[PDB]
Design a protein that fits this description.
mainly beta; Immunoglobulin-like; 7-stranded mixed beta sheet; 4-stranded antiparallel beta sheet; 11 strands; immune system; nanobody GFP
């Protein structure tokens, strides 16, 4: 089969504050050849871009509002796309899917993530 496969993981029920690092395994399709399309859509609400880079692999794109919160990157040696998540928020509760266009429409699915509210640690 001459078809690429996308692996989306990292999105799950996590606690508020701290930091999260999502990953995306590639299959049949080179990660150091094109950029990784990142997007997020809340339940009931419309979808909104989270990260977008160029196939060239020069620099990433992110609004001045989202900047310094979410960045897109990938490694050729490991062949995987990483997604840094800083300054987590409560509205983060949503799904994150990927998309790639290399000769044929190829898109993953979308990982759901949950951010609990303020609470006390566990002793």
């Amino acid at each position: 089969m001459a078809q690429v496969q996308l692996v989306e993981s990292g999105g799950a029920l996590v606690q508020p504050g701290g930091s999260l690092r999502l990953s995306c395994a590639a299959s049949g399709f080179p990660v150091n050849r094109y950029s990784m399309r990142w997007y997020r859509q809340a339940p009931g609400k419309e979808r909104e871009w989270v990260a977008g880079m160029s196939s060239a692999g020069d620099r990433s794109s992110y609004e001045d509002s989202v900047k310094g919160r979410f960045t897109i990157s990938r490694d050729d040696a490991r062949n995987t796309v990483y997604l840094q998540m800083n300054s987590l928020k409560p509205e983060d509760t949503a799904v994150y899917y990927c998309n790639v266009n290399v000769g044929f429409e190829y898109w993953g699915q979308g990982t759901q993530v949950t951010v609990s509210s303020h609470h006390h640690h566990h002793h």
